[PDB]
C-alpha cells in the first residue's frame, strides 16, 4: 500500500513531468508494441499500428490521462479506476498480465525524458504506485 511519503513523492514527480504526459504515452505505447509483440493484437482494429502511427500517438494521450486520473485518485485507486477496470475487463478484454508490461514501459520512458527528476527515491514510490494502478485495473477481472 502507498504511504503518505509515497503519495507525496508521486504527486511531486507528476507535478514536474505531467506537462509531457502526451509524449510519455505515445512513447510508452510505441515501445510496448515493439518490445512485447503479444500486445499488438489489442490495437489491431486500428488502421495503423506501425512505428510513428497517429492512432498510437492519440491513444498515448488517453493512457497518460488515465495515469493523471490515477494520481488524482491516489487515495483510493480501486474506486477511482473502477470504470477503466470494467472497460479493460469486459469491453476490451485486455489480458491483465499486460498491465505490468505497460508500467515498465512508462518507467523506461520517464527515465529517458526526465533523468534528473527520476531518482531512485522517485522510482520506488512510482513503482509502488504503478503496482497499485495495475491491481485497481485488475479489479473487475475475477
Amino acid at each position: 500500500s502507498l504511504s503518505d511519503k509515497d503519495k507525496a513523492a508521486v504527486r511531486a514527480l507528476w507535478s514536474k513531468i505531467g506537462k509531457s504526459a502526451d509524449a510519455i504515452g505515445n512513447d510508452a505505447l510505441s515501445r510496448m508494441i515493439v518490445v512485447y509483440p503479444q500486445t499488438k493484437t489489442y490495437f489491431s482494429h486500428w488502421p495503423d499500428v506501425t512505428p510513428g502511427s497517429p492512432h498510437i500517438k492519440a491513444h498515448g494521450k488517453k493512457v497518460m490521462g488515465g495515469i493523471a486520473l490515477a494520481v488524482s485518485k491516489i487515495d483510493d485507486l480501486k474506486t477511482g479506476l473502477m470504470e477503466l477496470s470494467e472497460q479493460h475487463a469486459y469491453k476490451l478484454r485486455v489480458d491483465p498480465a499486460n498491465f505490468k508490461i505497460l508500467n515498465h514501459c512508462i518507467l523506461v520512458v520517464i527515465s529517458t525524458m526526465f533523468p534528473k527528476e527520476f531518482t531512485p527515491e522517485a522510482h520506488v514510490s512510482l513503482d509502488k504506485f504503478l503496482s497499485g494502478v495495475a491491481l485497481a485495473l485488475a479489479e473487475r477481472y475475477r
Binding site: 515501445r31 508494441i33 518490445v35 523506461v108 525524458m113 531512485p120 522510482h123 520506488v124
Partner: protein, 146 residues
Amino acid sequence: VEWTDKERSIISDIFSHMDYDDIGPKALSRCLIVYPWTQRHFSGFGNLYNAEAIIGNANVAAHGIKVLHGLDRGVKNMDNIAATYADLSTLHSEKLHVDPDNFKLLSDCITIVLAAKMGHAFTAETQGAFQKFLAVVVSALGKQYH
C-alpha cells in the same frame, strides 16, 4: 534465442559506449533502493542507511561495476550464454543464497539507468535487444527450467 545480426550489432554498440563506472554503481544503488530487500546480501558494505548513503557507497559502486563486467562474457559469446554463466549461477545460488527473482529486478534497474543515460537514443528496438540479452543472462543465473 537465435540472434539476428541487427541484435548482435545493437548489443555490441551499447556495451562499447557504456561507461561501466557510471552505469554499474547507479544500477545497483537503484536496485537497493527500489527493491530494498536486496540490501540483505550487502551487510558488510557499510553505509546502507538511506538513499543518500547507498548512492554514495563505494562498496556498492565496486559491486555494480563487477555486475556490468560480468555481462561482458555474455556479450563476447552470445550463443553460449547459459553455459558461460553456470559457475556464476552456482555462486549466487549455493554460496550467496540470492533469490532467483532478484536477477530480474536488478536487470530492470540496469535497463532504467541505461535509458536515463541514452535518452532518445534508447529506441524501442534498442530496448528490445538489450532486454532480450539481459533476459537470457537472468535465465542462466536464476537457473530457470527450459
